[PDB]
Structure formats: structure tokens, C-alpha cells
Amino acid sequence: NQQAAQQQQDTISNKEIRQELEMAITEAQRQHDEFMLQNHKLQEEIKLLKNKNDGFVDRSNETAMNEHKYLNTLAHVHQIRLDLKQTQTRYNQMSQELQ
Amino acid sequence: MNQDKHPEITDEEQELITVEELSQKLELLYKDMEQIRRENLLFEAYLARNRKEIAKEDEVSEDKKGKGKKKDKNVDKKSLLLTNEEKFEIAQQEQDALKKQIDD
């Protein structure tokens, strides 16, 4: 029973594919839970800091700013951080070339 | 009643549909995790930057820790997570701080 097994190509009938997708989803869920923990601890620290430094009064009576606007500003923050990274990358490149 | 006899879907078709749904959910979960990781980085930067205020202000007030026996208010955990307005304020403040960082 040695020779006949080699050519048994693994034609996954979506069962092994299903299992791989499930394991990938489980890993994504664990990463999501880790990100939840990180974000929740960060938000708790930020809220305690804001209570300690900024006023405890909440400006909820203002116009309902769109969470779409909040996500736009968050994406803008991510883009600005990335741009900072690449800008310093070029800056160091030219600085080292000059040096 | 006209009982529309649905055609028998091969288990291969069901399996492929399940694979497609799993791939879509994996894409959604990866997008969510990327968003959450970006938010984690933003909030970590915010907290670290203000820890200078945290450390500077905490040190000043340590000697002021008197005999205050104020009853500890029971605030639910739901109030320890940033609301929409507070999250937007943090995002804008970190956006301004980051813009200053790129400038400098």
C-alpha cells in the first residue's frame, strides 16, 4: 500500500476548505477579542484622564455629530500617522545620503 | 396549494456556499480587527501623550491626598467606554497632535 497513495490528489470537497475557513475565522475572532481588550483599556484610561483633566460636563445637547464623521476623522488620523511614517522614511533616506 | 418543489441542491453546492460565506465573514472580521487595531494605536498614542499630563499631574496631587472619605460612587462599566462624542473628541485631538507631530 505504498505506491498507490502518492497520486491521491487532495481534492478538498469544501470540507477541508470549510475547516480552514473556520480556523481562520477563529483566529480573526481571537484577534478581534484582543483588539477589543486593547481598545477598552485604552478608552477606560482616556475617559479617566478626561474626567481628571477636562471638565466632567458632557456636551450631549449639541448637534448629533455623525459617527460617519468620527470614522472619517479616525481614518484621517490613521492616514496622517502613516504619512508621518513615510515622510520620516524619506527624510532619513536623504539625510543618510547627504551624510 | 401549488407546492413549488425546490430542486435538490448538491452538497457540493451547499459546501461551496458555506465556503463563500466563511470567506466573506473572514474578510469582515479582518476589516473589523484592522479598524480595532488602528483605534488601539490611536488610543495608546493618546494615553501615552497625556501620561506626561498623567504623570505630571499625578505627582503634583500626591501630596494633596488628604483624609477625603467621599463615598465611592458605583459607576457601571458601560460608562468607562468612550461614547460617540468623546470618541470623536479623542480622534480630533489625536489628529491635531499627529498633525503637529508631522509638522515638527
Curated annotation (Swiss-Prot), chain A:
Protein origin, superkingdom: Eukaryota
Quaternary structure note: Forms a complex with CFAP263; the interaction is required for functional activity in cilia.
Location of the protein in the cell: Cell projection, Cilium
Compositionally biased tracts (Low complexity): 1-9
Gene name linked to the record: CFAP184
Species of provenance: Tetrahymena thermophila (strain SB210)
Record function comment: In complex with CFAP263, acts as a regulator of ciliary beating that connects radial spoke 3 (RS3) to the inner dynein arm (IDA) and the nexin-dynein regulatory complex (N-DRC). The complex is positioned parallel to N-DRC and forms a connection between the arch at the base of RS3, the IDA tail and N-DRC.
Phenotype on disruption: Mutants swimming speed is reduced compared to wild-type with trajectories wavy and kinky. Cilia length is not affected.
Membrane-traversing stretches: none
Protein name: Cilia- and flagella-associated protein 184
Swiss-Prot record, chain B:
Observed phenotype of the null mutant: Mutants swimming speed is reduced compared to wild-type with trajectories wavy and kinky. Cilia length is not affected.
Subcellular location: Cell projection, Cilium
Transmembrane segments annotated in the record for this chain: none
Residues in the signal sequence: none
Complex formation: Forms a complex with CFAP184; the interaction is required for functional activity in cilia.
Function of the molecule: In complex with CFAP263, acts as a regulator of ciliary beating that connects radial spoke 3 (RS3) to the inner dynein arm (IDA) and the nexin-dynein regulatory complex (N-DRC). The complex is positioned parallel to N-DRC and forms a connection between the arch at the base of RS3, the IDA tail and N-DRC.
Family per similarity comment: Belongs to the CFAP263 family.
UniProt name for this protein: Cilia- and flagella-associated protein 263
Gene giving rise to this polypeptide: CFAP263
Residues of the full protein shown: 1 to 104 of 361
